[PDB]
Nucleic acid binder design. Structure first.
Ligand SMILES: [Mg+2]
Ligand SMILES: [Mg+2]
Ligand SMILES: [Mg+2]
Ligand SMILES: [Mg+2]
Ligand SMILES: [Mg+2]
Ligand SMILES: [Mg+2]
Ligand SMILES: [Mg+2]
Ligand SMILES: [Mg+2]
Ligand SMILES: [Mg+2]
Ligand SMILES: [Mg+2]
Ligand SMILES: [Mg+2]
Ligand SMILES: [Mg+2]
Ligand SMILES: [Mg+2]
Ligand SMILES: [Mg+2]
Ligand SMILES: [Mg+2]
Ligand SMILES: [Mg+2]
Ligand SMILES: [Mg+2]
Ligand SMILES: [Mg+2]
Ligand SMILES: [Mg+2]
Ligand SMILES: [Mg+2]
Ligand SMILES: [Mg+2]
Ligand SMILES: [Mg+2]
Ligand SMILES: [Mg+2]
Ligand SMILES: [Mg+2]
Ligand SMILES: [Mg+2]
Ligand SMILES: [Mg+2]
Ligand SMILES: [Mg+2]
Ligand SMILES: [Mg+2]
Ligand SMILES: [Mg+2]
Ligand SMILES: [Mg+2]
Ligand SMILES: [Mg+2]
Ligand SMILES: [Mg+2]
Ligand SMILES: [Mg+2]
Ligand SMILES: [Mg+2]
Ligand SMILES: [Mg+2]
Ligand SMILES: [Mg+2]
Ligand SMILES: [Mg+2]
Ligand SMILES: [Mg+2]
Ligand SMILES: [Mg+2]
Ligand SMILES: [Mg+2]
Ligand SMILES: [Mg+2]
Ligand SMILES: [Mg+2]
Ligand SMILES: [Mg+2]
Ligand SMILES: [Mg+2]
Ligand SMILES: [Mg+2]
Ligand SMILES: [Mg+2]
Ligand SMILES: [Mg+2]
Ligand SMILES: [Mg+2]
Ligand SMILES: [Mg+2]
Ligand SMILES: [Mg+2]
Ligand SMILES: [Mg+2]
Ligand SMILES: [Mg+2]
Ligand SMILES: [Mg+2]
Ligand SMILES: [Mg+2]
Ligand SMILES: [Mg+2]
Ligand SMILES: [Mg+2]
Ligand SMILES: [Mg+2]
Ligand SMILES: [Mg+2]
Ligand SMILES: [Mg+2]
Ligand SMILES: [Mg+2]
Ligand SMILES: [Mg+2]
Ligand SMILES: [Mg+2]
Ligand SMILES: [Mg+2]
Ligand SMILES: [Mg+2]
Ligand SMILES: [Mg+2]
Ligand SMILES: [Mg+2]
Ligand SMILES: [Mg+2]
Ligand SMILES: [Mg+2]
Ligand SMILES: [Mg+2]
Ligand SMILES: [Mg+2]
Lengths: 99, 83, 104
RNA sequence: UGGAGAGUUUGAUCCUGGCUCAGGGUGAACGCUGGCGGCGUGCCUAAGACAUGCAAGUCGUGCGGGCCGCGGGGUUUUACUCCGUGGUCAGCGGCGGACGGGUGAGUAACGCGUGGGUGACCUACCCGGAAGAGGGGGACAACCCGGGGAAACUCGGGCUAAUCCCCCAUGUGGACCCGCCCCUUGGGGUGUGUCCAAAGGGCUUUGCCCGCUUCCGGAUGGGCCCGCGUCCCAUCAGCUAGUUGGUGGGGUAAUGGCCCACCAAGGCGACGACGGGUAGCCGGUCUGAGAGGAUGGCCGGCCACAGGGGCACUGAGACACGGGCCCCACUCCUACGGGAGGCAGCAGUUAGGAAUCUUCCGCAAUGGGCGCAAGCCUGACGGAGCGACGCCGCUUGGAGGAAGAAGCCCUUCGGGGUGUAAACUCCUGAACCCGGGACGAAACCCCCGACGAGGGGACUGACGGUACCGGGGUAAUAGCGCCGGCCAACUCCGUGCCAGCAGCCGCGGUAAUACGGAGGGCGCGAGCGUUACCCGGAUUCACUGGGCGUAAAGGGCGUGUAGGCGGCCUGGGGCGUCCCAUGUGAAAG
């Protein structure tokens, strides 16, 4: 009985949530950003796409994402957005993309 | 983290250490990266500490970290002495 | 060095992929006689370029599928269908050797 | 530098051929016997089940408190209330818990071995280099209040600090899209755009110590991929539907049918696929003249497993032995709803077995974790303990002593043997007693110097009153196997194809060097025998190194597929083959 390093388990759960949520926000912001481009609404589109770019880079500050996991999440998202605007668009706000 | 430390090599009651570089998570007498000296504590022979400063210096230069004992032996064989 | 084998295309019935056959002469361990011995590699033909009969060099590469770990490095000589036919009879024989039915 | 053979098929012979013996080896067990030490080594079976204890924590120099003290303040006094300090308890937070220790159940597999790849990658702590930390907000335990449950534990309500979480800034720099250059797989630049930083603590208190942030490099440790090597059965010949490839996705640190949708119809196999059987692999180990054969036990490397089957969370790292969830089987508590366990860590118990150890001592050394340090924690480990289980060393005495005591033995009735053996004379002195008494240990820390180099000082021994040295000193354990041949060593008595022996051939039927006893003898000796197993002899699976007319063995004969093999001359290539250089071949052995 008893081994006071079940403190570790205790705090793993606390973290399980910090991460869980951070990730959730990225996924739903991303989908959203990509949905704004499949409707070709570039002003809003990049404006969100940018908020999600941030959300990713931030998650990778601590242990939620790190490395090139983030960098992946980023391009795979940034790519799909430019391309869905290529289907008739003209990057209005052109926030998070290169000329 | 890589160490510079004494691996145990004598026999019962007759200890001989082998000063080595190794990853700190190896078992004490296990696989090492490189031997760079030896040391008999009981001074049974006129030669009982040897080092090779250059290799010792080399490893230190890349963050080998010596146990408080290996450092004593290292120091004593003039590993540190800069004057 | 990325290992490089030379072989014979015995199959291109596959999108973007050849089956290069590579042989190796060597003295036998115990008995000393020289024995040939050969192995089929799947090679990446990205631009459906090489065709069966080609003799190609095959190069060790980061994996393209399972089975697929080589890319066709260059063309040596072409057309030589002898080895293709050679390899082809070899398997046609299998029709017998069984319990069932088929003229080998 | 290395190579021995013998016995047995016949009246006899040569040959063929099997069986057997002589050697070596052992994590052994068994019988008889048993004296001291050193060093090793010790569940081969039940990866059966496990009582009790101990086995991974640490940091007050990250933070705020609860309980118990002691002391000092604000008021004339009380009340309330402020500060300091000793002890203690957990909480929040950081690093460790992914190492170290255990096992070989599974696994015939890129698992292992060896050589390569990664332009397809990760790497906490450590080293080096470049640059930085400005402003602001939040929550949850602790604590306080209340509720449910037998219990494990559990729900709700209210405060709160931080090196906990968050938003803004600065952008050295990095990340992402698009373009351009170099490079050639996703490598290295470069431009616009967008995105991303930080934490404080300590003092000998304006400067140091320890931390934090971003980037580049190093070191060390890993992931993945590839060539070749890796047991038996063909009385297992066909196998495959994510199957084989494509495109696009998802996923990951990263490649990949790893997974998914859609498309093509492929992929593998007699060079043994598929199935079955067996097995952790290696360095090595035993044997062998060698080639080979056998093996993988101590130790070291890798892999796999942590009651059985799945799964993810947290993390630099886990699909996590002493972490989480679920299903199964089993033991335990139970107020019948429900809970608790997991020695293949150290000891230990029980079961199974021919058989395998102490519920020991110590953190003194070495190594590890956290800590600035002092320290703490280490059943890692260093030691002791049991067992002739193995190796090595050592004793049971040494010199004299009859022409040869006694007893037992034999005899040709003279004798001959045990035998210098004993007795006995002298000489050393294992055991045992007394005295001294270790090496292993010098660092961390402290002082001078500068917290560097360097110098000075102090503390520390489980083993252990041991090893070793000095003095005193007693004649003071010998067994076991064998004696027909192989194979060193023969004589009496008893027995009568019985009782028995026996590795093989074989002994015993009334004169037994073969059975049981005795005397004697041979061989080893704190051991000697036995049984079991591996190599050897066994050229008895033959590559080295065999055979097939009659000893075992030519397919009933052809035709021919694959495959093996292939005349003479010249030229190219350089796959095989040979040569030079160089890298690798860890340590142990
Ligand atoms: Mg949603
Ligand atoms: Mg005969
Ligand atoms: Mg005869
Ligand atoms: Mg014979
Ligand atoms: Mg006994
Ligand atoms: Mg012992
Ligand atoms: Mg076992
Ligand atoms: Mg228990
Ligand atoms: Mg303890
Ligand atoms: Mg505490
Ligand atoms: Mg282990
Ligand atoms: Mg199998
Ligand atoms: Mg693998
Ligand atoms: Mg690489
Ligand atoms: Mg640095
Ligand atoms: Mg504040
Ligand atoms: Mg309160
Ligand atoms: Mg609340
Ligand atoms: Mg507040
Ligand atoms: Mg910048
Ligand atoms: Mg920039
Ligand atoms: Mg390129
Ligand atoms: Mg670029
Ligand atoms: Mg910012
Ligand atoms: Mg400060
Ligand atoms: Mg590296
Ligand atoms: Mg398909
Ligand atoms: Mg893909
Ligand atoms: Mg794909
Ligand atoms: Mg098979
Ligand atoms: Mg196994
Ligand atoms: Mg071997
Ligand atoms: Mg031989
Ligand atoms: Mg074992
Ligand atoms: Mg082993
Ligand atoms: Mg068990
Ligand atoms: Mg993670
Ligand atoms: Mg346990
Ligand atoms: Mg029993
Ligand atoms: Mg210690
Ligand atoms: Mg220590
Ligand atoms: Mg005498
Ligand atoms: Mg004397
Ligand atoms: Mg005397
Ligand atoms: Mg100390
Ligand atoms: Mg000073
Ligand atoms: Mg000093
Ligand atoms: Mg005597
Ligand atoms: Mg004789
Ligand atoms: Mg007589
Ligand atoms: Mg009788
Ligand atoms: Mg008689
Ligand atoms: Mg007779
Ligand atoms: Mg006799
Ligand atoms: Mg006999
Ligand atoms: Mg021999
Ligand atoms: Mg042989
Ligand atoms: Mg023969
Ligand atoms: Mg006949
Ligand atoms: Mg015959
Ligand atoms: Mg014939
Ligand atoms: Mg026939
Ligand atoms: Mg016949
Ligand atoms: Mg013919
Ligand atoms: Mg032919
Ligand atoms: Mg030919
Ligand atoms: Mg020829
Ligand atoms: Mg020629
Ligand atoms: Mg050549
Ligand atoms: Mg070696």
């Amino acid at each position: 009985r008893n081994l006071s390093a079940l403190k570790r388990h205790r705090q793993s759960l606390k973290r399980r949530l910090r991460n869980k949520a951070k990730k959730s926000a990225i996924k739903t912001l991303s989908k959203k950003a990509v949905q704004l481009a499949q409707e070709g609404k570039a002003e809003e589109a990049l404006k969100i796409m940018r908020k999600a770019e941030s959300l990713i880079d931030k998650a990778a500050k601590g242990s939620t994402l790190h490395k090139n996991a983030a960098a992946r999440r980023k391009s795979r998202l940034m790519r799909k957005v430019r391309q869905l605007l290529e289907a008739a668009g003209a990057p209005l706000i052109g926030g998070g993309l290169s000329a | 983290m890589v160490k510079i430390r004494l691996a145990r090599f004598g026999s019962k009651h007759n200890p001989h250490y082998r000063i080595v570089v190794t990853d700190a998570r190896r078992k004490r007498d296990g696989k090492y990266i490189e031997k760079i000296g030896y040391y008999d504590p009981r001074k049974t022979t006129p030669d009982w500490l040897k080092v090779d400063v250059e290799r010792a210096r080399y490893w230190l230069s890349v963050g080998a970290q010596p146990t408080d004992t290996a450092r004593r032996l290292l120091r004593q064989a003039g590993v540190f002495r800069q004057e | 060095p990325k290992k490089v084998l030379t072989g014979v295309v015995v199959s291109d019935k596959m999108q973007k992929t050849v089956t290069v056959l590579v042989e190796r002469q060597f003295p036998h361990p115990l008995y000393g006689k020289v024995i040939k011995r050969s192995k089929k590699y799947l090679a990446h033909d990205p631009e459906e370029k090489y065709k069966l009969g080609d003799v190609v060099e095959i190069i060790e590469s980061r994996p393209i599928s399972k089975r697929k770990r080589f890319r066709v490095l260059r063309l040596v000589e072409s057309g030589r269908m002898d080895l293709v036919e050679k390899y082809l009879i070899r398997r046609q024989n299998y029709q017998s050797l069984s319990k069932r039915g088929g003229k080998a």
